[PDB]
Amino acid sequence: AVQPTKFAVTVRQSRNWADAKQRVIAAYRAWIRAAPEIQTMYSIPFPVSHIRTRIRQEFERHRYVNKLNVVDVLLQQSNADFQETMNFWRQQSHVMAFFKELPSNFITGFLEGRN
Amino acid sequence: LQKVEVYERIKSLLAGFDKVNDPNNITETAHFANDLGLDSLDTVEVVMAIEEEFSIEIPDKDADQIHSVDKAIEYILRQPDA
Amino acid sequence: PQDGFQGTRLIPTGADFQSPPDPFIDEGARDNAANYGVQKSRSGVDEDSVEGRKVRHYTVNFGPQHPAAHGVLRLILELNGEEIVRADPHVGLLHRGTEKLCEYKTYMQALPYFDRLDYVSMMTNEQVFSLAVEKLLNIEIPPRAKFIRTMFGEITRILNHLMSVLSHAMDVGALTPFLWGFEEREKLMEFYERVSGARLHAAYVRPGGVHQDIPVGLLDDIYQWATQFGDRIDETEEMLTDNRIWINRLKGVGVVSAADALNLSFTGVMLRGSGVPWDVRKSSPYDAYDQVEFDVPVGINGDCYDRYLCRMEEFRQSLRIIHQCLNKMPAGPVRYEDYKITPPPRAAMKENMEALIHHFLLFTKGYAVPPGDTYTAIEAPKGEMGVYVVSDGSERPYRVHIRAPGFAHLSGFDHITRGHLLADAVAVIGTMDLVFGEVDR
Amino acid sequence: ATPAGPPPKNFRLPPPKNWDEESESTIDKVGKYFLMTEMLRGMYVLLEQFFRPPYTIYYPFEKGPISPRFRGEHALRRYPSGEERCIACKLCEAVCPAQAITIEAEERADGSRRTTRYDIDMTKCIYCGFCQESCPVDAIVESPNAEYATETREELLYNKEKLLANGDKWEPELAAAIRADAPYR
Amino acid sequence: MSAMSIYIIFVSIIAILFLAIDLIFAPHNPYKEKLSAFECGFHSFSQSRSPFNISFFIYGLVFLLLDLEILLLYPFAVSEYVNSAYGLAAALIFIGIITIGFVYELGHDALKVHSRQLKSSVVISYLGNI
Amino acid sequence: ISDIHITRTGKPLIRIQGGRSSLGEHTATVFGATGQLGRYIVNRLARQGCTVIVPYREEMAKRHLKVSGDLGRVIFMEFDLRNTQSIEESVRHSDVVYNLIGRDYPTKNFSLADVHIEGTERIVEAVAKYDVDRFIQVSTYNANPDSTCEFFRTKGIAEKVARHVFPETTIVRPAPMFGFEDRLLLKLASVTNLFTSNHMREKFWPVHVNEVGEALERMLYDDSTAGQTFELYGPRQYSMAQIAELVDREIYKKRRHINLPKPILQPLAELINRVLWWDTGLSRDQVEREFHDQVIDPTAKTFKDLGMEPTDISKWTYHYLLPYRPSTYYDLPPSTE
Amino acid sequence: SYPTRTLANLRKIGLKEYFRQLLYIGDTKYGELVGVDKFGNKFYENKEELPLRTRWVDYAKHDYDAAHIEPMWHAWISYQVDTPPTREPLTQIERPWAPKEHVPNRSFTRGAYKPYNTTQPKIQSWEPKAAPR
Ligand SMILES: NC(=O)C1=CN([C@@H]2O[C@H](COP(=O)(O)OP(=O)(O)OC[C@H]3O[C@@H](n4cnc5c(N)ncnc54)[C@H](OP(=O)(O)O)[C@@H]3O)[C@@H](O)[C@H]2O)C=CC1
Numbered sequence A: 001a002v003q004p005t006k007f008a009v010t011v012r013q014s015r016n017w018a019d020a021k022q023r024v025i026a027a028y029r030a031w032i033r034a035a036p037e038i039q040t041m042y043s044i045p046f047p048v049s050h051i052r053t054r055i056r057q058e059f060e061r062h063r064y065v066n067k068l069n070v071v072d073v074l075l076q077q078s079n080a081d082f083q084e085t086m087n088f089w090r091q092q093s094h095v096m097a098f099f100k101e102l103p104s105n106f107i108t109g110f111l112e113g114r115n
Numbered sequence B: 001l002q003k004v005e006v007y008e009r010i011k012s013l014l015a016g017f018d019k020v021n022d023p024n025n026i027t028e029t030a031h032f033a034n035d036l037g038l039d040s041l042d043t044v045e046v047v048m049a050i051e052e053e054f055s056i057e058i059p060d061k062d063a064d065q066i067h068s069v070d071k072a073i074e075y076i077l078r079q080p081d082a
Numbered sequence C: 001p002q003d004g005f006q007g008t009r010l011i012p013t014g015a016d017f018q019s020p021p022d023p024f025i026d027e028g029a030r031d032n033a034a035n036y037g038v039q040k041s042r043s044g045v046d047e048d049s050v051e052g053r054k055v056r057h058y059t060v061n062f063g064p065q066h067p068a069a070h071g072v073l074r075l076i077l078e079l080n081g082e083e084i085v086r087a088d089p090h091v092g093l094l095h096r097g098t099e100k101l102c103e104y105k106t107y108m109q110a111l112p113y114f115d116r117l118d119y120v121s122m123m124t125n126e127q128v129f130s131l132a133v134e135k136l137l138n139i140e141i142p143p144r145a146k147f148i149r150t151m152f153g154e155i156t157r158i159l160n161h162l163m164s165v166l167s168h169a170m171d172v173g174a175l176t177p178f179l180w181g182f183e184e185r186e187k188l189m190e191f192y193e194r195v196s197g198a199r200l201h202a203a204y205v206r207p208g209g210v211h212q213d214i215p216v217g218l219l220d221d222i223y224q225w226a227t228q229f230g231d232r233i234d235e236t237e238e239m240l241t242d243n244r245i246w247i248n249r250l251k252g253v254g255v256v257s258a259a260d261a262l263n264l265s266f267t268g269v270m271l272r273g274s275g276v277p278w279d280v281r282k283s284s285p286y287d288a289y290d291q292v293e294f295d296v297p298v299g300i301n302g303d304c305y306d307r308y309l310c311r312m313e314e315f316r317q318s319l320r321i322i323h324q325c326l327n328k329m330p331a332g333p334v335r336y337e338d339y340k341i342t343p344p345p346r347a348a349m350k351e352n353m354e355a356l357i358h359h360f361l362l363f364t365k366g367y368a369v370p371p372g373d374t375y376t377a378i379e380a381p382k383g384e385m386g387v388y389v390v391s392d393g394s395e396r397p398y399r400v401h402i403r404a405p406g407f408a409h410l411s412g413f414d415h416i417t418r419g420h421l422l423a424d425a426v427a428v429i430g431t432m433d434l435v436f437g438e439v440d441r
Numbered sequence D: 001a002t003p004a005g006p007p008p009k010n011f012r013l014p015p016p017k018n019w020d021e022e023s024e025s026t027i028d029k030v031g032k033y034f035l036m037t038e039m040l041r042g043m044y045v046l047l048e049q050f051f052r053p054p055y056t057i058y059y060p061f062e063k064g065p066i067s068p069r070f071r072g073e074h075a076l077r078r079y080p081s082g083e084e085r086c087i088a089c090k091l092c093e094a095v096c097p098a099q100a101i102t103i104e105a106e107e108r109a110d111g112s113r114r115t116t117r118y119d120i121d122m123t124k125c126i127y128c129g130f131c132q133e134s135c136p137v138d139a140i141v142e143s144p145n146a147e148y149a150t151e152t153r154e155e156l157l158y159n160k161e162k163l164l165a166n167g168d169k170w171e172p173e174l175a176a177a178i179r180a181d182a183p184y185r
Numbered sequence E: 001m002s003a004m005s006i007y008i009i010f011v012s013i014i015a016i017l018f019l020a021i022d023l024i025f026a027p028h029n030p031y032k033e034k035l036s037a038f039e040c041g042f043h044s045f046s047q048s049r050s051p052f053n054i055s056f057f058i059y060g061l062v063f064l065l066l067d068l069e070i071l072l073l074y075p076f077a078v079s080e081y082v083n084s085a086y087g088l089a090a091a092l093i094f095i096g097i098i099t100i101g102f103v104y105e106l107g108h109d110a111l112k113v114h115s116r117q118l119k120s121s122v123v124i125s126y127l128g129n130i
Numbered sequence F: 001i002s003d004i005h006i007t008r009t010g011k012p013l014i015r016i017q018g019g020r021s022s023l024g025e026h027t028a029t030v031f032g033a034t035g036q037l038g039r040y041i042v043n044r045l046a047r048q049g050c051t052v053i054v055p056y057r058e059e060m061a062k063r064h065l066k067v068s069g070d071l072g073r074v075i076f077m078e079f080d081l082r083n084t085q086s087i088e089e090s091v092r093h094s095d096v097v098y099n100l101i102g103r104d105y106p107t108k109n110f111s112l113a114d115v116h117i118e119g120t121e122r123i124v125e126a127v128a129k130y131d132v133d134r135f136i137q138v139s140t141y142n143a144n145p146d147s148t149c150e151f152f153r154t155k156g157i158a159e160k161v162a163r164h165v166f167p168e169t170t171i172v173r174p175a176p177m178f179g180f181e182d183r184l185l186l187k188l189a190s191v192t193n194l195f196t197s198n199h200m201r202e203k204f205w206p207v208h209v210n211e212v213g214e215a216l217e218r219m220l221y222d223d224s225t226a227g228q229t230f231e232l233y234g235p236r237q238y239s240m241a242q243i244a245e246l247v248d249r250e251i252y253k254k255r256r257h258i259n260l261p262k263p264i265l266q267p268l269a270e271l272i273n274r275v276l277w278w279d280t281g282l283s284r285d286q287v288e289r290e291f292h293d294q295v296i297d298p299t300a301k302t303f304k305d306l307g308m309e310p311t312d313i314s315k316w317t318y319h320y321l322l323p324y325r326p327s328t329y330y331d332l333p334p335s336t337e
Numbered sequence G: 001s002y003p004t005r006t007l008a009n010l011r012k013i014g015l016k017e018y019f020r021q022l023l024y025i026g027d028t029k030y031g032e033l034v035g036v037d038k039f040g041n042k043f044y045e046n047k048e049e050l051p052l053r054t055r056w057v058d059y060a061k062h063d064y065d066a067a068h069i070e071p072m073w074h075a076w077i078s079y080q081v082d083t084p085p086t087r088e089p090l091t092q093i094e095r096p097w098a099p100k101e102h103v104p105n106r107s108f109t110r111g112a113y114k115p116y117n118t119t120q121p122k123i124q125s126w127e128p129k130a131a132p133r
């Protein structure tokens, strides 16, 4: 067959919640380990602290998931997004599209038009 | 390396972390979760910070074992890099 | 669905049903020379899984802005010196959502999309879509349309091979045959622009026959071109077949075995190069093919040279088919004689009520295709081109999926190229005859 | 691989020929190797091309051939009296595969069904001819004109004023193309 | 002054005059993306300043010594009338030894770059039933 | 800020906010937009769906601006300063006129007085003639009719001419600007800028050009900014020596300069400017500014009056100077020293 | 061109025309006049020429452009008809609304076409009428 690429990971299902628990930590660790390496690959002018902050928030939005089959789709997406980033397939515009650098009240929203 | 040397730098880093509940609770036998108030992701960041400071790579199998300051000290002595 | 929330039985996987080979008769650790130490992990010390994730081979972006890329391919090559250890083709740079756009079109409105997939083989792409809708319509297109579609089907095959074979020779360094053959294709686009109004995107072959009838001078001019096209094939035959630089750039290059070529979803010359006798026009005759005689070129070594010899033979077989179509062209309509499907003549639409109502409904609502699904495949100039069309029973397709030969071929690139040099990759892109309108869709 | 049933007759290749079984003479084989013989033939074939007429035409003084069915830029056409042929049925707006046509109609001052808006986005069009195919009255046509390249994209947004002006200028060919191509439609 | 000395000057002033024109009468507007490496439109790893395998360096070593060998044959070419037979013999003895080392390089496949991308030997026999 | 803007002439503007396909309702004219600042104001106005007239001189140098806006949004008019008709044709459909026309050095057909005083005179007289709502003229820092530097004097007299003709002028005084294609950071990283009269010790409060284009956008929406005077300067004071120190730390090159005595350099600089056709950075007055120092004139509104807090030049050195790092040090992270 | 043809054409047209043709067509062509545009463009035919070269135009303007060819002649130069606009009846239908003058491609000039809305706005706002208190 054709060779899987450098960070290609075989798609496998989580055995139990302990499996998923350990994989999510492995994925979060691997992301924040790579933040210094992302910065010089993509010439990020922000410091690495901001990059790791964004990694933390992406993981935090899936914090309250209690379904193995939703976590494994999520562990799939991060694996592909990690592989995509580390092999430098995406470019600076894609990585900067990921950093964003709604009205806070009804009355603020009303006065400007909806938002 | 020296045990006191590989512990003094940890206290500065751990106190330097933004949102530990209080810098006094760091001891030689303190736990990140029970004492220092760090959740799963905060603890993974702490091992990540420790590895960067000591310029060593902490593997997935023994990275999980570091849930307390003493475990970090023993691993740092065990691994031959500084 | 609900059970997946918590842990349940794991879905069985191909790794589970693996079986151990029998040790009495097993001979060798590698019956394939594709994996015979010409891939990654043949050098260094440690594998690239642990402690090797910190280093890279020499990695070069071969395309998109590259001549040998022939367009819009991003082929990420890992080079060990000047040798390829891993090839990762990155596609989707001409992905324009054709298959989603077809779902907001009537069946007529979607036909010009097929002109733009393999965009050197327009009328052949039109045919596979016209034959799938005609099958779901349960109609039988008239004999004159079937002979026009087979004749322009082989005019299209020659047009593709002129672009394919001579682009491939240009990549290897031979410039002059490209220039000669592009006068012939420039000749053949007159035949397109005389029956349709376009040199390239004819929109000619449609479900129910063809759009208009051929003009009264076309068959004589096609025959006049046919009396000299043999000489054109021979003079390009005269610069490459025996050339010793041509032979040593293609013989033994891009070798795929017969049993692996089927397993790789290879079709067309990519399959026939490996020794398999297989032609979709021989095995599932469509249009007027079962009414003509032609031979099927089949190679024996499965390399770039045999694939070149098979394609240069198809020039001669296409010209042979074209002559029989000129001779056997029948009279009669070129559109199925049902105005509920095909548009009525403008004369009838301006003269009679039921012709006007049908013209009005066919161009606003479209015709309704009876519900169902189908896979329809034809021998496209680049291989088995297929379409999977799902029908609602309404006037818009529920699903149009295009099976593109070059999508299946570019996927087997790393299988046949890993271990060759950088020039040999250029050789394999051209023998595999890629157009990224069909690859990306 | 091969068809099911009896295997093809003589499908199995003959056994390989040895070096001393090839029936070519050494003088010929060595001569061809050292004299570069097959490539001298290719050199010669280029020579006789060198003494053949070229294929080149001198554009724009000479133009390549186009047919009555040729699809170029759009034009709106009129009857012999100067009345617009367009009646606002909207059929071409419906059939367009690229949604390049936007039409607004009303009853005209004299009660006539005529368009108020008629736009073709010439950067959305696919030049398929489906709009002229569907016209009930031969209003929208594609001219034989291909040379209308512009400096800006705003110049490619044709309104009714631009399209009628195109028909008013190109009517003699539009009529001669329809005359020559009508019986086949 | 000699033709050679002026010839060197004129070719250098031409190399300067052409260069000076472009350095003066052409627009110069350098920006970040204009000044990037060409990689067919995608930025990749910068790894052209790291060690790179050369699969033909054994050619470079043998090229080094066969140059010394053909240079040592050029004084003979311009001295044949005096070398004559006795001098010819030494020149042939020298070229024969040099040629033996060349047969060593052809024989061992030292001038061969290996690249591409063996039949069954298991015969089964049937005795039938026990 | 709202969906309704009401202008000084009283016309309402019912806006749809986002994107280049929407309705910003404002018709602007930006004189001097093909320079360095001009793109940032034009991109800001155009990408929010406003019609922008771009008076230009050389056709090929205006082309990057069309990408900013949708079809029919950015309208190019070919004009000259001494062509009053082309000036009047360019501002008469407009509700705001930006005057960004300036030049550091004299030219064979424009003195500093001719491009600043007379150019502003024609532009403002057309603003008065067709009753355009807003007029944001951009002067310089240290502008003073009593100045002796031709730059700071002539841009100080045009300030008074504009107010005398159109009193509702928003006068904007930026400090020396840094950014992409800036004549501040890119010259200190260059190799032509070797001559110098002072020891690069003159001080100023450098301001991001990106934050100045944003400031000019906000003056259009904050109608109360009319008739005001704005000094737009940065958060810190630096010398040319402190800025050049940052550049060397970033490009890793350690640039050097040749200092000259002003009675010697200034005459030469007036010769290079008179004998070369391109912007050489050297001229008699640019040497005179070289010896002058920036003063933030009080009673002048600031970035805070637009509700904006400018960022320091140090945070921007990596982004803009990285093209000038040598290959050996290019892959390194930002200095952040 | 080839020596037999070029000298034969050069003999027929004269040296002065030979150099004019080397300036615009860059070829040496001889043929008989078939007609003249409303724009002054001159059209020749010679069936004794290479295919697609038997018809050509001598452009009236120095700054010659392909869009300077009148519509009916645009079909003749394109081999879309064989009868020239001199002998073609459709060039006789009187249309008082037809352009009397020559209307070429107007891009890159100030006569370039500017598009616009041909329709009125879709919603009309109230004109306020503050009745006296
Ligand atoms: N950038 C800075 O450091 C500072 C800038 N300023 C002022 O800010 C404004 C914008 O700055 P910036 O964009 O950097 O300046 P630039 O010099 O880059 O741009 C000046 C603009 O003025 C135009 N212009 C100059 N002279 C004439 C003339 N005689 N006739 C017509 N147009 C002319 C130029 O058009 P063209 O390109 O066609 O010549 C150009 O678009 C200027 O007025 C400047 O003096 C003040 C303080 C600091």
Ligand SMILES: *P(=O)(O)OCC(C)(C)[C@H](O)C(=O)NCCC(=O)NCCSC(=O)CCCCCCCCCCCCC
Binding pocket: A021, A024, A025, A031, A038, A054, A055, A058, A059, A060, A062, A063, A064, A065, A071, A074, A075, A077, A078, A081, A085, A095, A098, B039, B040, B041
């Ligand atoms: P502790 O017991 O508190 O354990 C914490 C965790 C998070 C494990 C939770 O308790 C938990 O089990 N929750 C459910 C699992 C979960 O949080 N999410 C599933 C993991 S996949 C995921 O979250 C993917 C996030 C996005 C992709 C990765 C982030 C990086 C994106 C790109 C970064 C920058 C690139 C340019």
Ligand code: SF4
Binding pocket: D085, D086, D087, D088, D089, D090, D091, D092, D093, D103, D134, D135, D136, D137, D139, D140
């Ligand atoms: S189809 Fe023809 S007649 Fe009908 S609205 Fe369209 S252009 Fe007018």
Ligand code: SF4
Binding pocket: D092, D095, D096, D097, D098, D099, D100, D101, D120, D124, D125, D126, D127, D128, D129, D130, D131, D132
């Ligand atoms: S030819 Fe153009 S305008 Fe007519 S239907 Fe096709 S895309 Fe639409």
